Amino acid sequence: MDAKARNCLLQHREALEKDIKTSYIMDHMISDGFLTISEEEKVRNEPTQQQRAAMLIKMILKKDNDSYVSFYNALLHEGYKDLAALLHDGIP
Ligand SMILES: [Zn+2]
Ligand SMILES: [Zn+2]
Ligand SMILES: [Zn+2]
Ligand SMILES: [Zn+2]
Ligand SMILES: [Zn+2]
Numbered sequence: 300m301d302a303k304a305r306n307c308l309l310q311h312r313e314a315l316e317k318d319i320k321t322s323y324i325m326d327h328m329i330s331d332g333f334l335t336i337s338e339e340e341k342v343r344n345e346p347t348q349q350q351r352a353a354m355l356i357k358m359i360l361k362k363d364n365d366s367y368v369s370f371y372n373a374l375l376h377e378g379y380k381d382l383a384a385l386l387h388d389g390i391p
Contacts, residue, residue, distance in 0.1 A: 300391060304367045307389025308360055315382055319352040323377040324370070333362070333369035364391035 308315070321342050328334035338358055345351040359370050368390060374383040 300362060300364045300367050304364060304389045304391050305360065307386055308356065308367075311382075311385045312356060314385065316349060316352040316356055318382060319355070319374075319379065320348060321351045321355050324373040324379070325355065327373035327377055328366075328369045331369045331372070333366040334358075367391060 325334055325339045325342060329336060329339060342351050342354045342358070345354050359366060367386075371383055371386050371390060374380070374386070
């Protein structure tokens with residue numbers, strides 16, 4: 300993804316990981332088409348909520364612009380408008 304978007308995720312990494320429950324966000328991104336079911340299972344396998352969110356963010360950091368926007372939209376739609384507001388200015 301564009302550096303602007305990546306740097307924004309890094310800036311806000313700790314809050315994102317602190318706060319996010321992954322299950323609904325991930326099904327949103329899978330329905331959208333920008334997270335695979337194999338990626339989802341890797342996240343789901345982690346044994347705590349912080350560790351699942353850490354895995355998800357780790358994955359997203361390696362994806363493209365279209366995936367950043369899908370993640371952003373999932374935050375907007377699945378109960379994290381606060382976190383979406385932090386990532387808005389980083390949209391590719
Ligand atoms: Zn799923
Ligand atoms: Zn959704
Ligand atoms: Zn969507
Ligand atoms: Zn497995
Ligand atoms: Zn972390």
